[PDB]
Design a protein around this ligand. Structure first.
Ligand SMILES: *[C@@H]1O[C@H](CO)[C@@H](O[C@@H]2O[C@H](CO)[C@@H](O[C@@H]3O[C@H](CO)[C@@H](O)[C@H](O[C@H]4O[C@H](CO)[C@@H](O)[C@H](O)[C@@H]4O)[C@@H]3O)[C@H](O)[C@H]2NC(C)=O)[C@H](O)[C@H]1NC(C)=O
Ligand SMILES: *[C@@H]1O[C@H](CO)[C@@H](O[C@@H]2O[C@H](CO)[C@@H](O[C@@H]3O[C@H](CO)[C@@H](O)[C@H](O[C@H]4O[C@H](CO)[C@@H](O)[C@H](O)[C@@H]4O)[C@@H]3O)[C@H](O)[C@H]2NC(C)=O)[C@H](O)[C@H]1NC(C)=O
Ligand SMILES: *[C@@H]1O[C@H](CO)[C@@H](O[C@@H]2O[C@H](CO)[C@@H](O)[C@H](O)[C@H]2NC(C)=O)[C@H](O)[C@H]1NC(C)=O
Ligand SMILES: *[C@@H]1O[C@H](CO)[C@@H](O[C@@H]2O[C@H](CO)[C@@H](O)[C@H](O)[C@H]2NC(C)=O)[C@H](O)[C@H]1NC(C)=O
Ligand SMILES: *[C@@H]1O[C@H](CO)[C@@H](O[C@@H]2O[C@H](CO)[C@@H](O)[C@H](O)[C@H]2NC(C)=O)[C@H](O)[C@H]1NC(C)=O
Ligand SMILES: *[C@@H]1O[C@H](CO)[C@@H](O[C@@H]2O[C@H](CO)[C@@H](O)[C@H](O)[C@H]2NC(C)=O)[C@H](O)[C@H]1NC(C)=O
Ligand SMILES: *[C@@H]1O[C@H](CO)[C@@H](O[C@@H]2O[C@H](CO)[C@@H](O)[C@H](O)[C@H]2NC(C)=O)[C@H](O)[C@H]1NC(C)=O
Ligand SMILES: *[C@@H]1O[C@H](CO)[C@@H](O[C@@H]2O[C@H](CO)[C@@H](O)[C@H](O)[C@H]2NC(C)=O)[C@H](O)[C@H]1NC(C)=O
Ligand SMILES: *[C@@H]1O[C@H](CO)[C@@H](O)[C@H](O)[C@H]1NC(C)=O
Ligand SMILES: *[C@@H]1O[C@H](CO)[C@@H](O)[C@H](O)[C@H]1NC(C)=O
Ligand SMILES: *[C@@H]1O[C@H](CO)[C@@H](O)[C@H](O)[C@H]1NC(C)=O
Ligand SMILES: *[C@@H]1O[C@H](CO)[C@@H](O)[C@H](O)[C@H]1NC(C)=O
Ligand SMILES: *[C@@H]1O[C@H](CO)[C@@H](O)[C@H](O)[C@H]1NC(C)=O
Ligand SMILES: *[C@@H]1O[C@H](CO)[C@@H](O)[C@H](O)[C@H]1NC(C)=O
Ligand SMILES: O=C(O)CC[C@H](CP(=O)(O)O)C(=O)O
Ligand SMILES: O=C(O)CC[C@H](CP(=O)(O)O)C(=O)O
Ligand SMILES: [Ca+2]
Ligand SMILES: [Ca+2]
Ligand SMILES: [Cl-]
Ligand SMILES: [Cl-]
Ligand SMILES: [Zn+2]
Ligand SMILES: [Zn+2]
Ligand SMILES: [Zn+2]
Ligand SMILES: [Zn+2]
Lengths: 690, 690
């Protein structure tokens, strides 16, 4: 009963069976079908061997189209005739066409409205696209309808950016440049997005809050709710997504200025003129949106399974991923959920033979992840005192595949050594690496930009259920999946009705060998975290990255040498703290090596568990109280991306444009002090205790 | 080497020697004399046997009079002649008269100014005194100078109340009604306040922030400081304290309305007319203040001694009290500091014989307590991550005596059983209880209002160095001292130049037997907390008080039955949570009794240590982010008093006067939900862990 026993028990054939079982009907959050699947998983996890399996339910704000009053966009002529209408539904894939309850494309949490106006094209609607338009091209978006292509950043960041530019509506569309790979056919005959395909998705800006109505507290039976006008994160302008057939019709008539450069041109046979409005002949036509979706408080259900630890039952290692999908969820999330189900089955097989892990393992099937990480966040709000005093680590398990090229890992530096060591022990599933390790294929295909013979491991931001555990509570977190060779844009059929079981079985992973490889990485990590006598964290790896992040933020500031002189902006404290951390971590690692004494063992493992916790500031980041980690936060310009020393980064961002430089540079210095203090305080938790 | 060995080593004669040694010269915070005493204590604690003894220094905002431009108040006639001036210094006591560096009476952190105007007399300047004046007597304080007597509430609350009433200055004075006990002589021939005596003290409203310039972060070498205009807690109007000879001169000419009732009359031979202004003949005379004190960033020094634990060195039991005094500090704080010094000596004697406590004991001599708990708060800000994951308990040690009548204990319910059990083992020092226990004398002289044959134990608010540990960080805290038979007003010579060694030795405790009794209670508590195998906390005692506090807050709300019907205000969730807590605590106590297993032992002791921690809300109380405990906070009307369910209490306070009842009652319901949620979450930390 060791790790090898556990890993050998995992089977590709079982992952395939579960994936098929989870993807026959839609499992939209708050629907009866999704509740039924929750009850099924609860049942099976009990049969598989877990000690306890419970549903934790909450009542949260969700959003749905109006079934009898469809959302659509028109071009309207000078007499108010709607001369072109976008589609009311995606053409269903073969053999489905008669499935009911497929939600039509919509942007969850869009307000209602029927705005009409002239279009402006804003590329990906990134912060820098809006700077280009407004500062360089001197185009004003105020009172316009903006059209933006999906890709590059989280869609909620686009809508926030459009709102602050003064837009009165936003139309999001999938351009073939970003969602149609050359030389591959459209679904059902390949994995590309057809012109009628549309990406669903929420457009909230919650900044970690969870349910819009109950920030800070679980949305239980007696919860006090904010009124809709005070809810967190809701957009103030209507938003709707469309496919590229419809986009072509809206973009083909565009006039005004030419695109400022080629990085603004997608692959449609149109000019990609920025506008505002249509060319001379159509100058009197307008665009009109019709959005009628409603927000409603709805019950959601998480399944929480416990396997009690034999030695340290009050230390929790958590494996979690979501169960709700926009439609069938063939990749997102069921390729992850199927992997979690097979991991639970394997741990339960060991348990039935009398084994128990050293620490407690909790398994979670989260609900309403697609509506803003609601299920994981509410549960973590409810259980925050247990998690912050007992939580060892959180390993996420959303989509296992988004390509079939190589491994993609994002995690805390504390898990770098664990990931390197485990992947060296695992077989590569890749063509041309038979008999080689996963570490070898991964390092070859995704080399570290910094180091020779090491793979890339990225930072954690947000955009998945680890967010509350890592950014709010400071629990060491990690994720691993197979990916493509567009990092933040999604695979072509992302959030479309075409993301089905057949997509996966025919085009992504017919032998389920990439799924199996991901189950071995996720399950391998959980097993080591839950069973290793000393926690498998290496504090020296945090010291290395802290120096890199300090160099990088210093370099950004140093683009403004005159201001650093004028305002006496010194990074000396932060480098001093990083030096101290490096020195203390080196000595702690010696003791961890040099130290039969279980209280000594519980003391050193507590120092390792609470090291991530030490990077939490209880006052949070500026205007984002639920992002409390001082080293990492989700980028203010792109929730999906992690940013390092975020409080200093945001103080410096676009600082040359601030009207009161004294005040702006004062705030940079404040954030340097907070960062240096927190690094030093984290270092001190690794000193001898008395 | 048991508790009896420890307690028998403590000697009254040693406490007397230390008290004399600490009270020969003033030890004002930020002065050279106070730094010298810090170095002396550091030296002696090393000689006494501690493992390490360090100075932790910070640079914080302090306040001092201007030596060449004295503060005083005048009555000024219509030509601007100052016809009466208050005193520039207190007449020094016998044998001192030539001591230098006695700071004259002033209100620390008063702004500078020379306001002149008509006087209004506002009794104790409590919230209810201002309601009486403004609502019932229809007197307007706007643009007036207010005169208030000390007593009943913290002086900073008086100044806040005067500021919000629109006052342009505040004069505080000591009335013989509150500071002259009938039948006792004035100092030097008894313990009463003479007419030239004046009470110093700060008038800040920091709400737990610590140094006004660095809220949230330690005021270390690289700290970023707020500008004075954004500092926390500073009064916006001048303030000055005077004795009752001077007060009589200002009050004797008062006109306008008569006092509304006898509870507004002190013991001076004056009418106690409320004003505004003087009677007809003097109606053209005004009062003029002259305040010239300055705020300045100044270095302060805490001494921190460590006695490393033999079994659990990463669990900290902390005994702390302050060292800075306004003048000689014969009671406040040196009667406490002398007791701490003798406790350290006793623990060091055991240590030199080879003993070590089970857990780590930290001993602290805090600086700048008199200027707003600055030293303890800054240190706790620096070390917050260690304290919140390792802090077992904090026992405070300010003044050991404020009378000689009986024991006065304020603590968390988790320490009630510990205090009852220890005091039953200790000998009473009281006249007529020879051969009886301390428990017996204390229960007889201070009976519980609730229970038969039990002593009174009060709630913790603020006004001393335990505040950051308990209200911000949620570490179980307690305090114990001898007291009089005016609870919040101070003994007569409080903060005056007359509070000397001779005061104590002649009038309070000539045999040092009350000091010895307090050293046995404080030291006894530390010894049990640091040495008991199971932590000596009883969670069932928290369950009992929670029900009492729930009944009480319900009763306040029920004065408004029509509004509770209209707005559907239910306390059902809170009573349900209190019921659950009672049930879970009962079962946890059974397991703690029923459970050789040290990991099981470390698990249960962690549940006990983290139970106080579970009452912390990371979002804090409304507009008071550093008061985070949901069951207790310092009263918003009197920092010295604890308030239970403070978030609900403040939502209900004066609610009949709010202009938007819907909104006001909405906030009561929000606070009930937060309280019920936090009680339930604390209960869940005592459930089986997995
Ligand atoms: C990294 O770790 C090191 C410890 O290994 C730690 O060093 C500490 O640095 C502080 C700040 O530099 C030192 O503070 C000094 O302390 C002495 C007393 O020991 C004071 O006299 C000093 O104050 C004088 O000098 C200042 C600067 O010129 C003046 O501004 C001031 O008015 C005084 O004249 C000063 O406070 C401290 O002694 C060391 N501790 C050591 C060496 O053990 C460093 O701070 C750590 N880095 C971080 C970011 O925490
Ligand atoms: C004190 O401890 C007890 C547990 O011993 C705990 O009881 C829990 O109370 C909640 C709230 O009352 C119960 O929640 C119910 O759960 C069921 C499913 O189990 C739901 O069907 C219920 O919802 C229906 O009914 C509601 C009320 O009429 C409707 O508003 C709703 O729309 C649904 O129709 C409801 O959510 C929960 O089951 C129990 N758990 C038990 C008994 O084990 C209680 O909450 C604790 N107190 C506090 C303050 O936490
Ligand atoms: C997914 O698999 C589950 C579990 O095997 C299936 O649910 C079971 O269906 C059988 C036969 O209809 C019932 O007797 C059981 O009660 C169900 N078990 C449960 C819910 O635990 C389910 O039919 C499969 N779903 C699909 C779409 O194939
Ligand atoms: C776009 O859809 C709109 C709404 O369904 C169509 O306009 C409606 O047409 C019907 C039938 O002619 C009328 O009775 C409604 O009053 C119209 N409603 C409007 C203008 O809001 C429109 O015909 C469609 N356009 C195209 C090109 O198909
Ligand atoms: C990853 O594996 C390496 C190589 O085995 C581990 O480092 C060794 O650990 C042993 C056991 O303490 C030491 O005696 C060796 O000196 C280490 N070798 C080194 C550092 O080169 C490392 O601990 C593993 N990382 C984990 C488990 O997180
Ligand atoms: C308080 O007691 C201390 C310690 O006994 C005295 O300080 C010592 O004084 C002697 C003789 O002057 C010196 O040789 C030592 O170096 C001092 N020891 C220290 C500072 O640790 C101090 O004199 C006493 N103070 C008063 C006012 O009586
Ligand atoms: C109260 O004190 C003030 C200030 O010291 C006294 O007024 C000063 O008196 C001297 C000497 O006569 C003058 O030179 C100053 O110009 C006065 N300054 C003022 C009015 O601000 C005043 O005499 C004192 N009053 C009493 C009753 O002693
Ligand atoms: C205070 O003392 C009482 C009486 O000794 C302690 O309660 C007893 O504890 C023992 C040891 O577990 C039990 O077997 C008895 O049944 C308890 N007696 C009771 C509850 O009446 C109590 O634990 C002490 N409190 C402390 C140390 O916090
Ligand atoms: C959906 O369609 C129409 C819009 O007015 C009507 O049937 C109903 O009010 C709508 N339902 C809502 C608002 O949820
Ligand atoms: C953008 O246009 C709106 C239209 O009225 C106007 O209010 C706003 O000032 C304009 N901003 C700039 C910078 O041109
Ligand atoms: C899976 O791998 C093969 C090998 O390169 C490739 O042809 C296929 O397109 C890949 N699938 C996806 C969806 O990338
Ligand atoms: C103290 O007295 C006078 C007031 O102007 C002058 O000597 C000096 O400025 C003052 N010192 C201060 C402001 O600290
Ligand atoms: C109190 O007096 C001031 C004096 O101008 C005035 O501004 C204020 O409105 C008065 N308030 C009441 C309630 O009388
Ligand atoms: C100390 O105790 C005696 C006995 O009642 C009393 O006379 C004396 O006033 C007390 N001291 C104080 C300061 O209360
Ligand atoms: O709201 C979020 O933070 C992300 C939700 C969801 C994450 P997933 O698509 O499940 O990866 C999305 O990006 O639309
Ligand atoms: O600022 C405070 O919270 C209290 C300081 C001090 C407490 P102490 O007099 O030392 O009891 C006072 O009440 O003036
Ligand atoms: Ca919530
Ligand atoms: Ca501070
Ligand atoms: Cl993932
Ligand atoms: Cl005290
Ligand atoms: Zn997902
Ligand atoms: Zn998704
Ligand atoms: Zn004191
Ligand atoms: Zn004091």
């Amino acid at each position: 009963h060791n790790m090898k026993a556990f890993l050998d028990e995992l089977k590709a054939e079982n992952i395939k069976k579960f994936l098929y079982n989870f993807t026959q009907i839609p499992h939209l959050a708050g629907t009866e079908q999704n509740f039924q699947l929750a009850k099924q998983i609860q049942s099976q996890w009990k049969e598989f061997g877990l000690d306890s399996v419970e549903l934790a339910h909450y009542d949260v704000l969700l959003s749905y189209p109006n079934k009898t009053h469809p959302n659509y966009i028109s071009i309207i002529n000078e007499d108010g005739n709607e001369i072109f209408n976008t589609s009311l539904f995606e053409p269903p894939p073969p053999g489905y066409e008669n499935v009911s309850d497929i939600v039509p494309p919509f942007s969850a949490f869009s307000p209602q409205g029927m705005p009409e106006g002239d279009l402006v094209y804003v590329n990906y609607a990134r912060t820098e696209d809006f700077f280009k338009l407004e500062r360089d091209m001197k185009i004003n978006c105020s009172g316009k309808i903006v059209i933006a292509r999906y890709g590059k950043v989280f869609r909620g960041n686009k809508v926030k950016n459009a709102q602050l530019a003064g837009a009165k509506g936003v139309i999001l569309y999938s351009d073939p440049a970003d969602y149609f790979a050359p030389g591959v056919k459209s679904y059902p005959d390949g994995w590309n997005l057809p012109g009628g395909g549309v990406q669903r998705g929420n457009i909230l800006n919650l900044n970690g809050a969870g349910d819009p109505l109950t920030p800070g507290y679980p949305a239980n039976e007696y919860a006090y709710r904010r009124g809709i006008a005070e809810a967190v994160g809701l957009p103030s302008i209507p938003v709707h997504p469309i496919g590229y057939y419809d986009a072509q019709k809206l973009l083909e008539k565009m006039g005004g200025s030419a695109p400022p450069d080629s990085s603004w041109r997608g692959s449609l046979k149109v000019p990609y003129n920025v506008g505002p409005g249509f060319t001379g002949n159509f100058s009197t036509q307008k665009v009109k949106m019709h959005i009628h979706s409603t927000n409603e408080v709805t019950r959601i259900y998480n399944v929480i399974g416990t396997l009690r630890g034999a030695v340290e039952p009050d230390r929790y290692v958590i494996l979690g991923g979501h169960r709700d999908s926009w439609v069938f969820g063939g990749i997102d999330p069921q390729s992850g959920a199927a992997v979690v189900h097979e991991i639970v089955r394997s741990f339960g097989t060991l348990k039935k033979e009398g084994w128990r892990p050293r620490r407690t393992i909790l398994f979670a099937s989260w609900d309403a992840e697609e509506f803003g990480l609601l299920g994981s966040t509410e549960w973590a709000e409810e259980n925050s005192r247990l998690l912050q005093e007992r939580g060892v680590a959180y390993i996420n398990a959303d989509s296992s595949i988004e390509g079939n090229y190589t491994l993609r890992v994002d995690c805390t530096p504390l898990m770098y050594s664990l990931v390197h060591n485990l992947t060296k022990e695992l077989k590569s599933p890749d063509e041309g690496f038979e008999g080689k390790s996963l570490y070898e294929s991964w390092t070859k295909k995704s080399p570290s930009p910094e180091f020779s013979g090491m793979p890339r491991i990225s930072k954690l931001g947000s955009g998945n259920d680890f967010e509350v555990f890592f950014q709010r509570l400071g629990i060491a977190s990690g994720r691993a999946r197979y990916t493509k060779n567009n990092k933040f844009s999604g695979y072509p059929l992302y959030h479309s009705v075409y993301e089905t079981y057949e997509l996966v079985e025919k085009f992504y992973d017919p032998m389920f060998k990439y799924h199996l490889t991901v189950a071995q990485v996720r399950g391998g990590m959980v097993f080591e975290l839950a069973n290793s006598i000393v926690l498998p964290f290496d504090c020296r790896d945090y010291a290395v990255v802290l120096r890199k992040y300090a160099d990088k933020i210093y370099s950004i500031s140093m683009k403004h040498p005159q201001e650093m002189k004028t305002y006496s902006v010194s990074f000396d404290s932060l480098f001093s703290a990083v030096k101290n951390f490096t020195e203390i971590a080196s000595k702690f690692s010696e003791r961890l090596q040099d130290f039969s004494n279980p209280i000594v063992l519980r003391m050193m493992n507590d120092q390792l568990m609470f090291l991530e916790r030490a990077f939490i500031d209880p006052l949070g980041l500026p205007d984002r109280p639920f992002y409390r980690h001082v080293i990492y936060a989700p980028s203010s310009h792109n929730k999906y991306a992690g940013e390092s020393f975020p409080g200093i980064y945001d103080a410096l961002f676009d600082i040359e444009s601030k009207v009161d430089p004294s005040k702006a540079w004062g705030e940079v210095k404040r954030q340097i002090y907070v960062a240096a203090f927190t690094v030093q305080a984290a270092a001190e938790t690794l000193s001898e205790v008395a």
